[PDB]
Design a protein around this ligand. Sequence first.
Ligand SMILES: O=C(O)[C@H](O)[C@@H](O)[C@H](O)[C@H](O)CO
Ligand SMILES: O=C(O)[C@H](O)[C@@H](O)[C@H](O)[C@H](O)CO
Ligand SMILES: O=C1O[C@H](CO)[C@@H](O)[C@H](O)[C@H]1O
Ligand SMILES: O=C1O[C@H](CO)[C@@H](O)[C@H](O)[C@H]1O
Ligand SMILES: [Cl-]
Ligand SMILES: [Cl-]
Lengths: 785, 785
Amino acid sequence: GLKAINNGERYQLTSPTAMPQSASFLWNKKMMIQVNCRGYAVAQFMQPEPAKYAYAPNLEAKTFMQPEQPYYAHHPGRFFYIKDEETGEIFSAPYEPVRSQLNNFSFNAGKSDISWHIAALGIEVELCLSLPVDDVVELWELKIKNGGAQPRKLSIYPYFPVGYMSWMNQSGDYSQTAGGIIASCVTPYQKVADYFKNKDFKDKTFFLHETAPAAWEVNQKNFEGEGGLHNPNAIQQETLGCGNALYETPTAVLQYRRELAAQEQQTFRFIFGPAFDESEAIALRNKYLSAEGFAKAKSEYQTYITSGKGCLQINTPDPELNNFVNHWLPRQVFYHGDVNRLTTDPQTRNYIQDNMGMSYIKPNITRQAFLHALSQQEESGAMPDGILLLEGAELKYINQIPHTDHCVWLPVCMQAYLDETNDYALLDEIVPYASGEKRETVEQHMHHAMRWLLQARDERGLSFIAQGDWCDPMNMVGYKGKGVSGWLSVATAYALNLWADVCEQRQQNSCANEFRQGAKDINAAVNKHIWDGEWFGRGITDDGVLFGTSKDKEGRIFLNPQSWAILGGAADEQKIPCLLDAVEQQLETPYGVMMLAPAFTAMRDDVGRVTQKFPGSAENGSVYNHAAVFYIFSLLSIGESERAYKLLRQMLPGPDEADLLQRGQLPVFIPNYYRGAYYQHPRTAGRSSQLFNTGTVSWVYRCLIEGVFGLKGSPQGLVVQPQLPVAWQTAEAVREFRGATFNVSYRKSSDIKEMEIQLNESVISGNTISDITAGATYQLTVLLP
Amino acid sequence: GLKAINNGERYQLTSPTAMPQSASFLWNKKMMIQVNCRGYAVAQFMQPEPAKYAYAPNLEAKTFMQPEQPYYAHHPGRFFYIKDEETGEIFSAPYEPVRSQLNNFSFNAGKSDISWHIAALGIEVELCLSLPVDDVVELWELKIKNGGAQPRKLSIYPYFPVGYMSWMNQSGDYSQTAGGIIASCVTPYQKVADYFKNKDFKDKTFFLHETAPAAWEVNQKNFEGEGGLHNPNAIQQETLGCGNALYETPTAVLQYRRELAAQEQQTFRFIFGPAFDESEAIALRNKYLSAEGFAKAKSEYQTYITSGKGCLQINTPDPELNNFVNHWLPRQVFYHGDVNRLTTDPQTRNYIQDNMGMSYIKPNITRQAFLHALSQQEESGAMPDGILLLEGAELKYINQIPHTDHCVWLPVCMQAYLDETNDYALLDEIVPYASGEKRETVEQHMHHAMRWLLQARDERGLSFIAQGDWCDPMNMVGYKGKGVSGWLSVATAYALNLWADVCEQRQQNSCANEFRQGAKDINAAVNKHIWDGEWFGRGITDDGVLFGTSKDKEGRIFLNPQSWAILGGAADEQKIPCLLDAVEQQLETPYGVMMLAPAFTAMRDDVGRVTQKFPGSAENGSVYNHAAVFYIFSLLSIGESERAYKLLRQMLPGPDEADLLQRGQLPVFIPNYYRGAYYQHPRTAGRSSQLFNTGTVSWVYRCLIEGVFGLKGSPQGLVVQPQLPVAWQTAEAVREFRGATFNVSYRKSSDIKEMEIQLNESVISGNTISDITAGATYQLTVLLP
Ligand SMILES: O=C(O)[C@H](O)[C@@H](O)[C@H](O)[C@H](O)CO
Ligand SMILES: O=C(O)[C@H](O)[C@@H](O)[C@H](O)[C@H](O)CO
Ligand SMILES: O=C1O[C@H](CO)[C@@H](O)[C@H](O)[C@H]1O
Ligand SMILES: O=C1O[C@H](CO)[C@@H](O)[C@H](O)[C@H]1O
Ligand SMILES: [Cl-]
Ligand SMILES: [Cl-]
């Protein structure tokens, strides 16, 4: 079974084998943890760069998670063994490592915690994980209950494997003074500069108990012996051996021996995490490790998640959509803007898009993000590939490879901010540049961004692609300095059209004329060189070849040029239906729209690394949700309401059981992709990446608020412009906007020709609610033809 | 049980649980594989840089092996499941992954192959691995025999897990045309330059069958299902499902179904390895995958190992020493010089020391190695930190961190070469430098090396240490440009004394006077600033502090300054007994002599990274065998025969059972270390690193040939100068030298005062055999007081 519980606070899965990859996540200001239904987990924390405290059993590469992450028996996780001392029989919660037959199993994804209920051998177990807001520590609560009529003698053993911490130095032992196990390493390095760099690293891992245990074991190999994780030797004997680890792989295992009466339940608390030293661990113990510590953390964490609850609650005829939108969507948006994916150098397009989502959650965060981002703009007007969030941080990984699209996001996302808040006054704020002494207004920075995009174009009027644009691994189209991007061109025209509107709203008319004419010029160049007859091509290589065309067998059509040609005006009314039909014929699937098709099956070295990913995975033809939502936003922009909704709704798994089993994910987030290459590899199509980091969600939330429900801000107030799917005879939404609340009721009427809007029961003229008082609630009735 | 078999060709272990870390190795011109007794293996190959074909189940760091490598259930390995189709019962060879009760178990380390015999359920299994000389491929031979009286119906399943190959792209399927499983990936990267760099990578892994199987499975998860490795789901059912891997972790599993008659045995062959493409895999199949292919490979491989058999066969009263020396030592030496540890940039001291060992195996390799190394000498005279073996290779890892000792090895190791071969004419060969146009003789290059060492010294006359000397991680003594090394000083005096002797032998008398006076000057500076009263200190920091002294609590005495002070003459006859007693009191252990003591337990940042390794591991106070053998060589140099032998013999585990169990290794190699910190952590002391890469063995072989057996070359012929331990009443050695053979018999006589030597039964005067004819055999009798 799989369903929402607890009035939407949690989502419960009742089989540990039907959806074995399914997972949920938690975060806080400094860490995140992905937890698998069976007990495996991946946890990363910032200090201020990424690090971990629970390691693989080998030397792992520097990495958080892969799409479609595989697990394996020794993968890090969070486990408890229960042993009936009368019979010798054992089981483990949550399910791994023993995989015993259970009488009951529930995995509860929560907004603020992750929990399990399980039962075996007549013993009922509850396990609950949560995080505090501000510190790096896992709070664990274990309940064990004798559900039968006679007393039962049990051994209970937390098993929190620490793994292979370091080839240079790793160890562990029991600390009575800290009250638990302390594992210790030195992070490996060879350069003397790294010694100075690494000085404040939290290289100890603690596992601390509230309740003193009977015994402990810190040596992984001694724990398992010949029995392995299935039947550890240390658990077969009466008492743990109390061994340490001396340049041996450490582990955190405790043992409690209890005789429980009929119906008796006992509670045990633990904290697990990194520390610089034992004094930091004790500080966390004092702060957290108690009933009062746990309550106080949970109450503060609940407040934090509520502060990000967003601005739209819906009640539609689709209860799966209601649950997702009301409970899970705004939390996933909030994660992105509040902690920026836990990188010190967010990719610029990510930083701007994720903060765009915050417009609908905590717009002051958005405001500050524009100011921060623009302070790092180059004197030329160009934006850097990443935004540094800390003094001393550096550009890393893809951020070191020159991409060209970073400026385009500024007006695209600023538009959402200005529509929602009406904070035009942000345009007047003064910000420096990355170098030099110039300090200029936001508005002047934006002008320079748009002049950059106009100047970064070849003699045909098309934008240079260098080693990529929005498609990160599209790196061989323009690496020799001549290749251009189809997508970046049509997006630049959108960006310039939007910014020109803003300039007109601010009386900057020379700017409005310049950027409008730039957009026309680009669109004309697109129509002359990129349009391929039935859709727009993707780019032109360094050697003058147009790809993403009907003459290409693989990569015959890309989604993005089509969406953005719609948005930016390259696609006129005659071209639009060609676009729609080509997308439906070649890209639409039951799991959503693919970003390209057919997927590449071998390297094409005038396009690049994208073509080397497995066909159907990530940018190589997956249902890449962020590309799909740009298409949805484009469809909304031309009133293609039914097509927009159908494709948006495909992004949410369920309720169809085969769909749920095939995607393999809980419906508590949208992943960065569902596997594509639907025609070429149908067996795997739809499978979830399980990756909760995606810029998709800020756009999905925008599309629902402004597009589908049609409750959009303007300089006059709230514009009512719904595009509800025609199947809904009635719907409701509650919209928080500019400090007020709107209780909106939508209803289809036989007796009207045009939409009718009533405010507090009287008919308005026009479609804008203009008198909005902070703290007030308004009743809106929207009758639709 | 644990003993030599097959007239010394193999070494057999008969328990899979008593020594669970024990392993042996195989290599060839392009690869090496470490195989664990239980079936785990680590394999690396050169293409021309290091790579692998069997991967961990996660994203692993770029690495071969760690000291004291831990295993875990999903670690790469080489397995076969056997299923009784009548009962459902299963077991696996060699032992993992099922860990069933066996009726018989043997693990056979071989000079040329690795094999197992096991029995369970009345079925007898043999498994044999070998490599060819020149290609990268594992040759596997499986025999299955019904040992009972009735027919038996079995399923037999090779399980060669491929692991997680790549986040970008991984897959696998069955290829009828190749005749087996082909797994395929693209090695991940992001920089366009890496695409061009990676073009010839062997990114497919094959598992090819000689005999067509009933079924196959290429999806790891489908193979295991809920049963895991213990009881795979795919093996529970009647037939494998024949599934593929599509951006899923691949595996190589086949299924054979057989009814075997009473006493019937069947043989099955497979090859496993990397390939660029299916055409390369088929090429390997045609070449190797047959009875004739396997025989031809084995016969050619046996010839290759015999070509490296070395120059000394012994028959002493210690049969453990005989076995090691005769069978295992020369093979380990040969590996080092023949393939240079499978790095394209050997550390200079390693390249020179390993090739020194080749003096006794294939001296023309040594000769060529001096010429190659010197061609990369800098115009200053300094030697680079590594030696590049291929055009386009680069310095990597420690080779990028400035160390200062590289020149000292040249005369130290050249001496062994000249004594063994008498090839003084090498000195006249002309070689360029790393830059510039100068081409000069070997002899002139050497002069410039020794002038470098003289000039790289501070105002006190002591050698600069920069970021390390022989002790690789000793990086904070001199990183600010002032710190000096105690060891490098006393070694430089040795090197200069040796080279001066050579110059005198060549009539270069001005050179001999200059280098001799340099040595005296250094030794005087050592005695004034480094001698600490009872032993020599290790160095002086950038801020003027002498460490490795009686005032230091940790790192109170280092071994190396003492050995090399003996060799280079800083230690006079009054100091020597202080050295010996300090080493015995503070450094000697039952497992050998520690390199420093007590081990460091925390960072000391004017000494550096060495102090951060776990106490007892590697350079932080282990029995670091290469330091120990320098001390043994120093003891031989002053006729401390009993102490030299006792410490050399401690490097070989066994026959004491507690010793064997505690070190945890087969006696078929010397590891780079046995765990130290004997006083501080006695539980783990003696544990083998299991690392067969070590410069120890060229020195151990030298010490035995020239020192203990005392059969040493000179410009006059063979000098007879044995230092046998006094317990041996008789011994024999057969020595190959300058193309002749010497059958030497040693015997203790009551009736003489001085050694007496007879050649072909007549007494000689003096101790040199001077008339040596190539192809002749000489009988030598050495009577000793
Ligand atoms: O192929 C790649 O280079 C990676 O997929 C990137 O596109 C990353 O996913 C991105 O930097 C977010 O981490
Ligand atoms: O601590 C370290 O830097 C490593 O131990 C080195 O000393 C390597 O072992 C050496 O480069 C051989 O690989
Ligand atoms: O993973 C990603 O993929 C996207 C497609 O390459 C890119 O636009 C985002 O900035 C990046 O986070
Ligand atoms: O691992 C090593 O350790 C030694 C000690 O640091 C060093 O001298 C060798 O060159 C190096 O191979
Ligand atoms: Cl794209
Ligand atoms: Cl040393």
